[PDB]
Each structure stands twice: as C-alpha cells, then as structure tokens.
Amino acid sequence: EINGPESVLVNTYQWIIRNWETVKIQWSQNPTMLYNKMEFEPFQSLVPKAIRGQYSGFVRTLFQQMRDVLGTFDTTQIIKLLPFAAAPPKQSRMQFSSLTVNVRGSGMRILVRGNSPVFNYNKTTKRLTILGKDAGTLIEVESAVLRGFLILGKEDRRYGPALSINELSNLAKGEKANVLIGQGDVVLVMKRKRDS
C-alpha cells in the first residue's frame, strides 16, 4: 500500500517481519549490506533530513553494542530501530530517547525504549502494530538503548537520584547511575569500559 507516509511505515515493518529469518542473519553477519538495502529508502524519506545521519550513527552503535554484549539479543529492538540505520552515519555524543519520522507534517516519535503511537509491540500476542495497522506477528540487560551504556536493570537507590539522559556525560567508565530513561521509568545503567 503506497497511500502516503503511514503506508510507507507499515510496509517497512511488515517487510522486516516477513523477511526476519534472513534479515536476522544479515544483521549479525553483514550489517553494511542490510543497512544499504534499497527497501529502506522509503522510510528514510520520512526521516528529517537534518538528523538522519546522526540517527543512523546512533542506531549503528547500539546494534554493535548488542552484537558485542553476549546474551542481549532483542528482536523487537532490532526490528524497530533497523530502518534508522539505513542513512549514511554521522557521529555525535548525543543520546536519543526518540527517533522521529515525518507523517503529513507531524513529527512522530518512535521511542527507543518501549512502545509508542508509531511502534507498538504486544508481547503476549507477538503482534506488531504500526500506527494502528497490523504489521504481523513475530515468530519466537539492555545493550541497544543508550550509546556507551548498558541498562543493568531496575533502579538501584544506592546509586542515588536519577540523572536525565543528558547528564550522563559526567559518568566515568565502569561508573553506574540511575537514569530517567523514558515513560515513568528509572533504570540502573553503567557506562561501558568498551566502545562499540
């Protein structure tokens, strides 16, 4: 269905679920090829031109963190963020809690952690809904939310008051803090000793 921006989004994610068995493998083994797939061009046209590259740099880094940190594979996070990795990457130190696509003049937020009006995944039914439309069902520590950090788990009061995602510049490597990550949530994070 190519009736406007909403159709482009729904179809992009439908294509990923449809092709997930091959897409998974390529994501693991040959990501440049996956990111360069011409099927991500439509989605990319909806991503604000001024920030596409940074978004991609950001998402490419998260994906590498996931590849490097054993046991942190997260299918829905990979599916959600994948189209944003299709831009030529530009680096920054910026942390994004949401990634915007432009739908008829409106800037729609795809939240990096969790569900949003654009990307809603039902963990029980395994159904992915995209702006109201079914994109299909998925057949069966957070390493791909913040750039340079792992989310270790729920808030640990011992590490004190929660920082905003913006105040994490001040952490040393190996250091941990609570972070207001989005929604009602505070989570314990650790700045990584490795770069990805």
Numbering used by the authors: 538 to 677, 686 to 741
Paper passage:
Each segment is packaged in a ribonucleoprotein complex (RNP) together with the nucleoprotein (NP) and the three subunits (PA, PB1 and PB2) of the trimeric RNA-dependent RNA polymerase, which mediates viral transcription and replication in the host cell nucleus. The PB2 residue at position 627, which in nearly all human and avian influenza strains is either a lysine or glutamate respectively, is the best characterised polymerase determinant of host range and virulence. Here we extend the structure-based exploration of host determinant residues through the identification by random construct screening of a new PB2 domain (residues 538–693) that contains position 627 and is thus denoted the 627-domain. The 156 amino acid 627-domain is located between the cap-binding and NLS-domains and contains six of the seventeen host species determining sites described within the PB2 subunit: N567D/E, I588A/V, T613V/A, K627E, T661A, T674A/S where for each position the consensus human and then avian residues are given.
We have also determined the structure of the complete C-terminal region of PB2 (residues 538–759) which contains both the 627-domain and the NLS-domain. The 1.95 Å resolution structure of the double 627-NLS-domain (residues 539–753) shows that the two domains pack side by side forming a single module. The well-structured part of each domain shows only minor differences from that observed in either the isolated 627-domain (RMSD of 0.5 Å for all Cα atoms of residues 540–675) or the NLS-domain in complex with importin α5 (RMSD of 0.78 Å for all Cα atoms of residues 694–738). Only the inter-domain linker (residues 678–692) and the visible part of the bipartite NLS (residues 736–741), both presumably flexible, show different conformations. The inter-domain linker comprises two parts: residues 678–685 form a poorly ordered, flexible region while residues 686–692 form a well-ordered interface between the two domains. This interface comprises 11 hydrogen bonds including one salt bridge (Glu687 to Arg650) as well as burying hydrophobic residues on helix α5 of the 627-domain and on the NLS-domain. The complete C-terminal region, comprising both the 627-domain and NLS-domain, also includes the host variable residue R702K and, in the inter-domain linker, the HxN2 subtype host determinants S682G and S684A. The atomic structures reveal that all seven of the host-determining residues are located on the surface of the double domain. A superposition of the double 627-NLS-domain structure, assuming it to be rigid, on that of the NLS-domain complexed with importin α5 via the common NLS-domain shows that there would be a significant clash of the 627-domain with the C-terminal region of importin α.
